[PDB]
Symmetry: C5
Subunit: 309 residues, 5 copies
């Protein structure tokens, strides 16, 4: 018959979410409860009812006793897992109580940047049994699993946490146990508002103020320089994300400001060309130039907002 | 009954405070005194009264003797703890004297940037007993704990150090011992004064000098370029901090310079529009333009200083 | 006679491809099946038919039994290989079943940037037997080897995966077994289109719009500044690649924009010099200046497209 | 009575001095000679007179023989100490000969940037005995300690090396031995001359050349832009140093160029305002403007040179 | 008498050459052949003639047998040496066959940047015997040592490889064996040509084209801005190299462009001052201004080329 292995995983800290590399890093405690009757022992009066072991000698004890332990893997782990504690407490009964305190990076393959920076992402940790379900079956260790109260993450905000069990077929032909700790997190928009939206909007608004000066040459030079500023913001954004094969809401927004600014240069070159090809006309054309600018940006804003919502 | 475990923690060095990642790094010595009568030994005349052990063989001796050691965790530790010394001295009595010299990063979840750069922060180290208070009770090892005299931190200045004991319920249902080393540190303002305040103030003051040249076009071009410079300083500041969900005193200060500069462009466009819509007037309007500038910045400065103090 | 060693390698994750350093990083599982009759054992009823060992004690068992294991090396590995699992399952028969879960960087020496960013690259992992083919022969472990379904790579797209066996002569004079896991990957052009092509094309197109303003001085200043922008893009590109000894398609493209922009400055200086050396002429010369610009870029485009295709 | 422990430390390489983090990194060999009569042995003819041990088994031999070794700590060490060799050679006499080859970062808390880049710094390595002077006394191992002949440091130049012994009271109430390897190093000014002094001086000198063009507006625009360039150099310098709480000679130098440039803008605005408020006057005022510039920078240079020397 | 230790070192990969830190990184295989008659063993018919050992148990076997192994150090190694394989094969004879597969950084103290980027550098690996020549003598293991055929280095190109033996006196008074693997490598100029020479030459050439426009003010503004561009290229170069105490050919080249550009500003200010102090003169002076520019750069080019060749 298969022995129940009680898996518990608790994330104490989120040391960071690296969206460029699509991974996240946590400080966590893994807890396992497993009754192996073969490991049971008799004790004399005064001798302890609970034997405490360093994982190293406990595994050496299992090999001696010819017992198979529920060998597991953190399926989505990346790099080195720095350990803090790897402790076993064995009861007279044969109940193994294991605690694994670690710091580790995990793959975040659920990353969908299509609505960035208004995106919500899924992060998970996969704990797999190397041995199949006929030998060991993972069960949910009750009242332990989840996320702590001092995670230390400032940009992201965890919306919900879930735990479930599923099968995997990584090394075996038959199904094998898999414990899942899943969490959803959305972004704090403050950075994007302060460093990207407000500056881009200011550049556009204060640039429009200068149309009231009535100098066509100055306008063309202003829109030309604005175009270079947006090209620069385009690089600022690209540095936050991986070199995706798809368009972001942010990408569409920047490409949008390029297209409008390109057309502002085109329009004002065209209006100056009309002045040159024929006083009351001059001031009549000026009205189009001044009212074109806000209408072009308001038309662009309605285009993205429709294309993404 | 529970055995007293004497915890002592001394921070020799502050290898750095990383405010972007909200963690800090220290070189520290952990000292433990624990009397276990079961570990007592008899010695012959001339044979040593104190046995010195490498942690590895000492733990192997405890497992042999079926003794439970006060297994502890640095609760707020992050990543790898690089060890220098892990030495045990066991007296004839059974008094275990442990020394743990390490370099490690620790989570700084008490980070409040709301008044940055005039902020004071709390940094702590949590040492938790894995076993509950019925088995082991942490006591304060007197005359050891604290912070050294060559911490090597240049930006920060430690205001006070404290040590206290508390309970935690991390792995157990019953209360478990927790030793706390807390320290408060405030910032040296010299960097911010030299690299941010003085430059921003100079750009504003020397830009005002040019108003006395009496060219409205040149003023609009000056404020426009100044706006771009502040957008650039805005990115310089954002790189020091995490992508917070809240507004900083620094953030308010930069958004403030944007708003005033935006209004300077607006005002000077408006004053040039007034000149155009009707000599003594010209020079009368000029007085408003020249006196507007200092009043706008002095009004902005009074707004933030009120909003934050 | 030589014993068959069954090699299986599966890449679960592509943690990244670093083209500047010409290496790649993976999370992978190595699986080995090897029958050693000497390791066979007899068991009593109830005693397990499969013995599970930590690599450490299994190798200690081989040394004891004076047995030689199929010592292997990942020939193209770089730096530290962080291990997750190193587990042995030994059957009554003497069939050793080994699993090696690791994270590691590997040399990518097949990097050909000649057609970058339209390039396709070869990535491989070499598993070599230290002992020659007369002792051990590598065989392909069927139904395991390949690449997973959640690799997590966003810029690159895997076109095909292959496994084959070959000989090597690294440490021996006689041939020795080598297992190869090869994969081809092409690039997602979206980043290059959004951040390099569209901006460069916009700068060129909107700059041409201003020729219709009919100011020769303004044109020379525009082309001069455009040249500096391309010099800046030239540095942006150079940061993505190693300091190659050969010319890239991208390199040719940027050198191309330099040459045309240099000639635009030369041509417009020449046309202004013609105006100065002799009204209907002025406007006749203007036609050449305006039609020169698109023809020069269309001539350049045809030159690279011919030189590379 | 106390046993003499002979400490020898030789720095083979200076892998770098990181002034921003106030630490330095070395490749070094630690050598210890210690006679423990208890470790003495008898040998048969043909059997070796010197027993060679890996530190691991030598410490296991000491624990067996119940001997206390002179446990030491590198007091100012930071992070991980990567070891190359840890070898023991035990003579028939009981003379332990230990060699420790390592790569490690050490705290440089003696960093005084007040006269940077004309600064001289003190770097040291502290080797402390964990046990007090009544048990073990550190002595200077003659003819070994110092700094090698291929250190590999290019910016810094070692002026002198010293070795001495002192007491410490880190873990004990009674004095404990401390071995000190100290070295002084001064900086090669070439980088600062080529990248900071020459450019700043050129910008100032070639900007003065344009005063001979006799355009007041052009001068104000030139000094304004120069001010921005110095603000940029100010950030270039700040990146080399920690965020100190004190003013550097370099800091004073840059603040100096700001103040003079601010006054150049002020003066030329004032002189243009004098022209406007009343031909031979014009050309008379021009002389003040042209001779002001060199006198202002020569007055600034005399101010810093007095304030720091 | 002394026992011959056969050293073989083969570099499989050059993971990089870091010229800023003056070190290089390799993947290499170290091979040792050493006959120790004391390690010889007798075997029964059918029992193996070759015993295979993990370094750990082989060293434990040497300590047991009271044998001294040829303890060695990679003298110029830096940081951690990540190992792949550490395997021993012991023949009936007592012939120890050792293989050490590693990834490691090594000090490159032979770095001479005086002719950069036209420089050729020496890179080496030093393998030293800890024990002197009376105990162990290093010999060249024939047909193994050298550099592989898939080094993966793109900027550098290996000109020649050499192996030799020498003495050292690092830990001993008497001479001790040292094995040396040396290689010379020169640089691929393509990066410097594409990113530094072509842009600098273009800026100079296209700037000269505008002299034919005949505007003295525009020329002074052009040379002024060019000076700032070169100051920027000066920082781009400085980032590639350490903060050397000597002048590079590249450094001389950039300082050269500063001096000429400074003189171009000086000359054109002077020529405009001559126009102002006295039509056919105007156009006569113009010839000097236009022909000065190419002569000044051609004179500068001949100065460096003479000073360095
Ligand atoms: C920058 C947006 C500010 C709008 C208000 C108009 C004042 C002028 C701002 O400066 C100008 O900005 C252009 C575009 O960025 C540059 O081409 C130009 O060289 C620079 O002098
Ligand atoms: C900018 C702070 C210094 C103010 C002193 C006045 C002299 C001119 C300085 O150059 C100015 O730089 C801005 C930013 O690039 C441009 O927008 C502006 O058109 C330009 O005139
Ligand atoms: C940038 C191309 C945009 C084309 C639209 C025409 C308006 C002017 C854009 O500003 C230009 O920016 C360059 C930046 O280097 C300067 O050198 C150049 O003198 C300036 O005129
Ligand atoms: C700038 C140092 C070299 C001085 C030599 C005189 C020629 C003009 C150089 O161009 C200057 O470039 C600055 C860039 O910031 C502008 O602000 C300023 O208005 C402009 O005149
Ligand atoms: C840049 C070299 C190109 C040569 C061809 C002349 C066209 C004008 C290019 O813009 C120039 O950029 C310089 C650097 O910022 C400024 O100093 C200068 O006043 C400005 O006119």
């Amino acid at each position: 018959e298969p022995s129940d292995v009680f898996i518990g995983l608790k994330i104490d800290q989120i040391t960071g979410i690296n969206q460029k590399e699509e991974n996240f890093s946590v400080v966590g405690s893994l807890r396992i409860d497993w009754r192996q009757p073969l490991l049971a022992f008799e004790h004399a009066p005064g001798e302890p009812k609970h034997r405490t072991y360093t994982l190293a000698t406990f595994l050496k004890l299992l090999e001696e006793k010819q017992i198979r332990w529920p060998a597991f893997t953190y399926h989505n782990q990346q790099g080195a897992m720095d350990f803090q504690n790897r402790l076993i407490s064995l009861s007279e009964d044969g109940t193994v109580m294991y605690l694994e305190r670690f710091t580790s990076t995990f793959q975040a393959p659920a990353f969908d940047f299509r609505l960035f920076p208004f995106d919500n992402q899924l992060f998970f940790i996969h704990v797999d049994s190397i041995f199949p379900q006929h030998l060991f079956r993972f069960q949910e260790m009750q009242g332990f699993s989840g996320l702590g109260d001092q995670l230390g993450e400032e940009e992201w905000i965890v919306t919900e946490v879930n735990t479930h069990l599923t099968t995997h077929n990584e090394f075996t032909k038959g199904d094998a146990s898999r414990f899942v700790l899943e969490f959803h997190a959305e972004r704090h928009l403050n950075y994007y508002l302060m460093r990207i939206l407000i500056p881009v909007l200011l550049i556009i608004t204060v640039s429009w103020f200068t149309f009231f000066l009535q100098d066509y040459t100055k306008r063309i030079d202003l829109a030309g320089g604005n175009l270079l500023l947006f090209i620069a913001f385009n690089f600022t954004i690209s540095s936050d994300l991986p070199r995706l094969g798809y368009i972001t809401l942010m990408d569409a927004f920047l490409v949008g400001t390029f297209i409008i600014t390109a057309l502002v240069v085109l329009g004002n070159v065209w209006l100056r060309r009309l002045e040159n090809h024929g006083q009351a006309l001059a001031r009549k054309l000026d009205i189009y130039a001044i009212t074109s600018y806000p209408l072009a940006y308001l038309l662009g804003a309605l285009t993205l907002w429709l294309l993404f919502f």
